[PDB]
RNA sequence: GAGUGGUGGCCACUAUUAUUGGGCCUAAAGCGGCCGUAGCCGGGCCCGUAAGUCCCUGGCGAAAUCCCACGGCUCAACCGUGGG
RNA sequence: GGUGGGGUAACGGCCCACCAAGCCGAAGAUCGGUACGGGCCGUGAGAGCGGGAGCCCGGAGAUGGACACUGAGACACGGGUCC
């Protein structure tokens, strides 16, 4: 269920088990990463650039080709903007609920009686709190960095 | 050198007359493994051990901890949080009865 | 701790007035001439024991158990209790009649040494009955299979002598 | 959350047999459940089972026969000895040979039986009778 | 008087209570302050098992070795310091480890004069 | 024992290794110092009295042994609290009998009877080995005697060796090495009394003592601690075993 | 309510932890440990006791019975404190006066306190004089000392 | 039945302490609500390790006490020799 | 806890001189209550619950509190000194 309201809301994405791309696509992988580098360069986020991807040049997603270096993984859109070095320096989530945060803290400042948004901010924090310990644990964020509100 | 272990010694030699690799102290006993969490004194450290006791009432497994002080010599010098094998010897001080005889694996 | 303390060798009724154990009781005390209760479930309490040992084996397996198996049916054939050819099955088939049957009273009983239950007990406690050349004056003891045919009046006793007048009373049955 | 998968299956199986259900799809597959379903077809508590691919954990597919009283798991994991099969089996089963215990051991996953005459112990994961 | 058989304290801190009375095997004795006299004195003590050791209270003489290996009985002048107490050189008081000064130069006592009743001393360079 | 040593020994608490009844009195013969120790000795009052039965009581026990009819390893010993132990001779020159003194196959002593010739050796397993002052050696044997050996021959003698030794004389005349191939008679532990050739040996660190594997003679390997197994000859026994 | 918990195969600490909290709940485990009976017992925990006679007493039964109970009223030796106790028997008051020693038990009530239409009353009588009252009431011995 | 009753204590009765194995809408019992630190419980596959776990084997856990067969006191209670 | 000593039959904060700030604790320290420990014993289908005088093995005491002589061993129940 929801991590705080305790609904149960189930849509989602159905996809179907294939392995090889379809017949119909017609791109190679060097075409899909010049297209993912170029798309990066204009400022989209990695969930945006899958969207367009899908949506306007018919490519269902880029986990169906190999990594051509590695032959045990396949291919993930961060991992083509690391091998290029476009790749972010802190994890995209966490930097979205942070900025979400931060907007929200200028609105309880003019109105301090608003006592139900500010539930929400705490919410809010509890998910960054959360996240920070996720990314400490696996190395992707170094052991000092701290998230302090009036920074 | 060997004193009875069958490990390696460590690189570099002391003074110390209480180290076994390069003093007059003996070991004998009983032989523990465990990880450093605290080195404050000097030459002192302390180890500590995890195991688990069976509750025959209740059939489960309850965990439990055992913490011992241990002589740290200059030539080894363990810090907090590394792997640690240490032995019995004769009584040090009011607290010491083991001496750190090998680091196995740093922090 | 504590040092030993020794303990009762039988066992006591769960209820003292049950109707029908009551009834039962005094059918077996009646028939066999015993002098109270005790001595009744004194005999009880041996048969539980040989049950108790024969549900017990029957669900182990090993060494030791097979060695006290064998041992069990030995010794119940010895008593006289089994045929020679009885398997582990059959001693959860025993009654309290046949363990009563062993009694030197009874065996006293149906020789023909007496007339009676209470003439054969008070044969045996006077001293009259001798059992493998040795005088035995204990009315419950247990007989052996293997000496049954050597029980006789003692060799001083004056029934050992064919014109004594009570002797020839109980011939006369 | 979802804490273990095989006591999912065995509870759904056990409920879809009292109802007459004829077949039955467990749907996070594990190479342990596929285990004791083998187990279970062995000694004829189940028809014939498959695995069917999705591009998740798969899906298994069985067949019943409505043979089956009652089947669950144990928890926690209790080990056992090469020698202590008994007082397990008075506190699972109706009778002194009816139905299985389910044990792995350091030699695969089987039932008491074959076990106990192999002479090796392990733990306990579920009973079925 | 000097017992030494355990402390009454626990390495938490808190207290003991004593649980029977001070056995005859655990006493210890007054130390020896072996000084520098002119006339030297010792004694002689009874020990568990009946054993015997001698104590030197007044010390006049030393022996003193080289590195080659001889060694000279010599007389002692004074102690230059000893590391063991703040007011031992001024008291002139000879333990192990001390500094003496005698008429062919400086030592360092290698000996315990209140066990054995003898000082011996290496030559300093 | 508050303030010294203990001079008396319970019947219930007597050693395990013993043919006594421990209910029948209250106390029992607590034994002298000497050779052996109490896991492998008993009393010589006991085999007086109670194994062979040459007397009733204790104290028509004392006149015999007064008197000098009891010989171990051939000197005369008169203390009935004197222990005899494992592979000690115990011989009646009046009554002309020999025993050797044995575990049985449960860890209780038993005498065993011998032949005259027999009678004359005794087996001393090598306990230990040191130097002695003018630089000579001392071999401590495993009842507890010793024996000086010049410095030439230092190099026939290691522990657990088997030295067969002339009584009461003390003269060498044989030595048994212990190696592969050698025949072994088990004194203590679970595989008490029985007796093979020997098949391996083991060794561990921090010392923990070493093990021995054995064959017996239907083809059985089993093993036992280094120090239980008394070499007893080459490839057949020495002295005579039950 | 959910399962019954905890069920973990490494949680006996907890588990023999709630047990020992929900056993002091019990009343007959409490006042064991904590000996709550000793501290209030007249008797100190004996099965009888002995005891002086101070006065006569009457004593009106429950509702809804009618009649009254002969009683005394007993200093006890061993502590000084005064108890009533219950004489039992037809007639059984007569035996007994003023300035008389008694040993006195307790009278067999439910939980080892009252019992019948006389709450109030723990203890009866056993003896006087040292001689039983049971044959004083039926006959078979005559009271001493006149 | 040479015993048989009275008072007080502990176990059983009692699944009225519940691991095996109890309850919490109306009968005693779900914090007024929520967020979260230690602890407990934790999804699928592949490779390694061998701490837990399982099997085999050495050294120990005195005697008395417990169970079984056989033997000595008339049988037994008791005591001895063996196996557990 | 470290360094240097003393003392002891012997290792040791056992005790001193100097140098540091360590050591234990909600997985219950510290303090208070009650109690000699065990082999064992009572009860129960078992899981358990309760007890630990008598026989054996270990500890402690000799009116309460302190302290010495002799001896291989005692700070000694039928040996000594003080309150
Ligand atoms: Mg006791
Ligand atoms: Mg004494
Ligand atoms: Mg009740
Ligand atoms: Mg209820
Ligand atoms: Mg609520
Ligand atoms: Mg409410
Ligand atoms: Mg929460
Ligand atoms: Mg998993
Ligand atoms: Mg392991
Ligand atoms: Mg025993
Ligand atoms: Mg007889
Ligand atoms: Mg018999
Ligand atoms: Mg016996
Ligand atoms: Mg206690
Ligand atoms: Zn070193």
């Known amino acids: 269920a929801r991590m705080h309201a305790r609904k149960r809301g189930k849509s989602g994405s159905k996809r179907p088990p294939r392995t090889a791309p379809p017949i119909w696509l017609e791109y190679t992988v060097e075409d899909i990463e010049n297209l993912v580098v170029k798309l990066r360069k204009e400022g989209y986020s990695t969930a945006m650039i899958g969207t367009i991807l899908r949506d306007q040049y018919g490519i269902p997603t880029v986990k169906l080709f190999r990594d051509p270096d590695n032959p045990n993984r396949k291919l993930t859109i961060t991992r083509i903007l690391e091998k290029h070095g476009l790749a972010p320096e802190i994890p995209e989530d966490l930097m979205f609920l942070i900025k979400r945060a931060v907007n929200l803290r200028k609105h309880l400042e003019q109105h301090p009686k608003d006592l139900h948004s500010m539930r929400g901010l705490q919410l809010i924090e509890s998910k960054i709190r959360r996240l920070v310990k996720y990314y400490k644990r696996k190395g992707k964020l170094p052991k000092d960095w701290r998230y302090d509100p009036e920074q | 050198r060997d004193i009875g272990l069958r490990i390696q010694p460590p690189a570099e030699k002391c003074d110390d007359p209480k180290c076994p690799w390069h003093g007059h102290l003996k070991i004998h006993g009983r032989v523990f493994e465990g990880i450093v969490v605290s080195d404050k004194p000097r030459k002192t450290v302390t180890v500590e051990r995890q195991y688990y006791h069976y509750l025959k009432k209740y059939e489960r497994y309850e965990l439990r901890r055992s913490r011992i002080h241990a002589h740290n010599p200059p030539c080894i010098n363990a810090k907090v949080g590394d792997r640690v094998l240490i032995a019995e010897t004769r009584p040090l001080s009011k607290t010491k009865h083991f001496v750190v005889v090998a680091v196995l694996e740093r922090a | 701790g504590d040092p030993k303390r020794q303990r009762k060798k039988y066992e006591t009724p769960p209820h003292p007035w049950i109707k029908e154990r009551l009834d039962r009781e005094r059918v077996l005390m009646d028939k066999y001439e015993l002098k109270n209760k005790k001595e009744l479930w004194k005999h009880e309490t041996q048969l539980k024991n040989f049950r108790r040992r024969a549900r017990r084996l029957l669900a182990a397996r090993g060494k030791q158990a097979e060695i006290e198996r064998e041992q069990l049916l030995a010794r119940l054939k010895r008593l006289g209790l089994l045929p020679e050819d009885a398997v582990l099955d059959d001693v959860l088939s025993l009654t309290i009649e046949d363990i009563l049957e062993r009694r030197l009273q009874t065996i006293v009983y149906k020789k023909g040494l007496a007339r009676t239950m209470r003439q054969a007990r008070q044969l045996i406690v006077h001293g009259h009955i001798e059992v493998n050349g040795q005088i035995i004056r204990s009315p419950s003891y247990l007989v052996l299979k293997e000496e049954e045919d050597t029980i006789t009046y003692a060799r001083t006793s004056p029934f050992a002598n064919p014109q004594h007048p009570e002797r020839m009373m109980i011939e006369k049955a | 959350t979802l804490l273990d998968p095989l006591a999912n299956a065995l509870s759904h199986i056990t ?23 083998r187990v279970m077809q062995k000694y004829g508590y189940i028809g014939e089972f498959e695995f069917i691919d999705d591009g998740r954990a798969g899906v298994y597919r069985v067949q019943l026969l409505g043979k089956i009283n009652k089947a669950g798991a144990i928890k926690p994991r209790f080990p056992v000895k090469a020698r202590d099969y008994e007082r397990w089996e008075k506190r699972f089963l109706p009778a002194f040979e009816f139905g299985i215990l389910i044990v792995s051991t350091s030699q695969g996953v089987m039932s008491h039986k074959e076990a106990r005459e192999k002479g090796i112990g392990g733990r306990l994961i579920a009973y079925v009778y | 008087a000097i017992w030494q058989g355990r402390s009454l304290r626990k390495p938490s801190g808190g207290r003991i209570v004593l649980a029977r009375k001070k056995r005859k095997r655990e006493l210890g004795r007054e130390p020896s302050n072996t000084r520098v006299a002119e006339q030297d004195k010792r004694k002689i003590i009874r020990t568990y098992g009946g054993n015997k050791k001698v104590r030197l209270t007044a010390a006049a003489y030393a022996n003193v070795f080289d590195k080659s290996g001889k060694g000279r009985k010599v007389r002692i002048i004074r102690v230059i310091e000893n590391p063991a107490n703040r007011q031992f050189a001024r008291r002139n008081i000879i333990t192990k480890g001390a500094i003496i000064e005698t008429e062919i130069g400086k030592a360092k006592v290698t000996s315990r004069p209140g066990q054995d009743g003898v000082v011996n001393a290496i030559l300093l360079e | 024992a508050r303030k010294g040593p203990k001079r008396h020994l319970k019947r219930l608490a007597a050693p395990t290794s013993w043919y006594i009844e421990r209910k029948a009195y209250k106390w029992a013969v607590r034994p002298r110092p000497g050779p052996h120790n109490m896991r492998t000795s008993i009393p010589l009052l006991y085999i007086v009295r109670d194994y062979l039965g040459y007397a009733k009581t204790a104290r028509e026990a004392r006149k015999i042994l007064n008197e000098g009819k009891f010989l171990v390893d051939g000197r005369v010993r008169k203390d009935y609290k004197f222990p005899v132990g494992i592979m000690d001779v115990v011989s009646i020159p009046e009554t002309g009998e020999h ?144 | ?60 039964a429950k509702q809804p019975n009618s009649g009254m109970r002969k009683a005394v009223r007993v200093q006890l030796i061993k502590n000084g404190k005064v108890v009533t106790a219950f004489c039992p028997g037809d007639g059984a008051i007569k035996f007994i006066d003023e300035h008389d020693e008694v040993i006195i038990e307790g009278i067999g009530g439910p939980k080892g306190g009252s019992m019948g239409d006389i709450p109030g009353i723990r203890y009866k009588v056993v003896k006087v004089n040292r001689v039983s009252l049971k044959e004083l009431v039926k006959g078979r011995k005559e009271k001493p000392r006149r």
């Open chain 4, 15 to 37: 409920n879809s047999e009292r109802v007459g259900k004829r077949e039955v799809y467990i749907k996070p597959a594990s190479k342990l459940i596929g285990e004791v379903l």
């Open chain 6, 99 to 242: 025993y050797r003194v044995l575990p049985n196959r449960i860890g209780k002593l038993i005498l065993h009877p011998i032949s005259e010739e027999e009678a004359n050796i005794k087996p001393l397993r090598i306990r230990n080995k040191r130097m002695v002052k003018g630089a000579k050696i001392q071999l401590n044997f495993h009842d507890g005697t010793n024996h000086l050996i010049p410095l030439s021959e230092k190099d026939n003698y290691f522990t657990s060796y088997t030295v067969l030794m002339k009584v009461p004389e003390r003269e060498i005349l044989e030595v048994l090495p212990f190696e592969k191939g050698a025949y072994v008679f088990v004194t203590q532990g679970k595989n008490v009394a029985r007796k093979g050739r020997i098949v391996e040996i083991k060794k561990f660190p921090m010392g923990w003592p070493d093990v021995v594997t054995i064959e017996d003679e239907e083809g059985e390997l089993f093993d036992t601690l280094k120090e239980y197994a008394f070499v007893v000859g080459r490839d057949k026994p020495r002295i005579s075993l039950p």
């Open chain 7, 1 to 60: 309510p959910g399962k019954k918990a905890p069920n973990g195969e490494f949680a006996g600490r907890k588990l023999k932890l709630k047990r020992k909290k929900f056993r002091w709940s019990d009343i007959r485990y409490k006042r064991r440990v904590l000996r709550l009976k000793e501290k209030s017992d007249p008797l100190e925990g004996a099965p009888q006791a002995r005891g002086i006679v101070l006065e006569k007493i009457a004593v009106e």
